[PDB]
């Protein structure tokens, strides 16, 4: 008997919470289900926790919010049903989810572009082109800037979907092939200097970037610009085991010419301190030599002179030499020239006088009273100032590359923009430090921005449909965690870090003690663990993350010695001089301010949300793994959207469509009944449906989660029955 059967998604091992199987419900009580596992054991589950399986009619829906059992394994299942038909795009409420097929699919042709022109989301299948077109028409209709927030680690398709957005916009708004290629060739340059191998991804973005596609008031593409945010400069001087420095370093050493190698005095990576501690210098399946060629070509395409290109690589090389400088305490308080080979190599490439540099590194002068005093520094402080020099140099170089790229892109006659945002994703390593807290804070704020945007649209939808149901701002769900990190009163983690940083005698231990004293057992989003003395936990939208406090006081300071700045202002290199002559705040306060400026920008826009994901970690086509997929959906906020969506009345059916499907569940209700609302009510009343589970709108019946599934199950049963139920 087919239609008596009900299925459930369950975890064979609850602690592997994203690995599911399909079980069969056999018994039902007030508050629970009993079901049978795939191998035959019976289990129980509370109805409040149960993940029922949607009837087959729901398989393949284009928007996850149409699912009636809206739950995490059901979401995976729908994504899989579409993926197994080579439908890689699916909506989940406001999100567009894009799953990498790891093979070529011809869905980005000129015939496909044309189908999406002027079509609203509900008239065409899910597609990145559909997202792009709606953004473009909204921009013009509302005279408002747009943002596209696109997630995805390398391998997921984020770069390919960004390219598709740009290609589409150029096709619907171009008159502009040279601009488009210039925009696209920015990414290999920034990636070389802003991406790195971590333990979780071979090509991780360690910075955020907003690409503006600019339009004139008439709607034609008129230019572009790029803005960068929040580059992680700490990686330049230290990498954790098995990770790498920024790509550009390995690209330079592997693909440079023999003369370039000689001219810049460079050996292999493990010859250099900054690239030789992690134990990893190469990435399987990646050729740093080829990538370097790709970088060079991109720089040519976007207008970098050969003169500039050589000075860029001189600074990259200079940083490497600076890193191999070994300070030694010539016995006494101070540090000495140990061996001058690294310094002169750095000074050669930088165009700087070497004797000036070593003096500014170990014996910087700062005004004592109101006159100069040569401060001789010990080896420790000499190394840190050397490290701060490197980090200042890399970050100034990064900002210069951005400025140079923007110079070549036009920005005249801009009226509007459609902006693509690409930021470091939510990340949990084995050990998480201050860098991870900052990244995860950014993502908490970005998810709050999504949630709040969803809220404003849901408020309008319920108002328009005249639905008797109230709900509070979804963004409030994020506020406890955000306040715990960035709050002022009560002070959050970053405020307390700042308060401790001003005392030179503060320590790792005084800082963690202060954090525990403020938050342990007092804030539900914070955890003091029972056995670590150096870690605390924060409950993010994407899960708890444990943070290790070691070195955070030093990480929160970024002083640079003026004598170092003065030294580099004199240099021969045209680029180097720019880094220092174009024009007290802690790192945490900087991070907070830069994030606040990004958020301000985003608040002026109408946002669109694209979530690119990989189906598995083996780059294989036709292979989904729920564990892999659900981790990404948790981190990128799709499962947070589901959490919110499943709480109200997610399923919303035009009355006539409801009647066309379910008229047969009630006597004397015609399939094409004239008064569709009255027929809907007749079906619901005949079925004895609890009226708390639905609301009548002006044009649609709204259902709580699960209720439409039960009606569907009754239809499945009625069709194969010899008479109506008893
Ligand atoms: Mg990528
Ligand atoms: Mg994808």
Numbering used by the authors: 28 to 202, 208 to 615, 627 to 769
Sentences from the paper on this structure:
Despite their specialized cellular functions, all members of the myosin superfamily share a common multistep mechanism of force generation—the chemomechanical actomyosin motor cycle. The myosin motor is thus subject to substantial conformational changes along that cycle, traversing through different actin-attached and –detached states, eventually amplifying them to a large scale rotation of the converter domain and swinging of the adjacent lever arm in the force-generating power stroke. ADP release is key for the regulation of the mechanical motor function of myosin as it controls the fraction of time the motor stays attached to the actin filament.
The overall conformation highly resembled the previously solved structure of a myosin-II-dynamin fusion construct (root mean square deviation (rmsd) 0.54 (chain A) and 0.57 (chain B)), which was assigned earlier as the Dd myosin-II rigor-like state, with the converter in the down position and the relay helix straightened. A twisted transducer in our crystal structure primed the nucleotide-free active site for binding of ATP, with an intact critical salt-bridge between switch-1 (residue Arg238) and switch-2 (residue Glu459), which has been suggested to play a central role during Pi release. In our rigor-like apo myosin-II structure, the interactions of Arg232 differ markedly from the blebbistatin-bound myosin-II·ADP structure. Instead, Arg232 formed a hydrogen bond with the backbone of Ile460 (switch-2), while Glu180 of switch-1 interacts with Gly457 (switch-2).
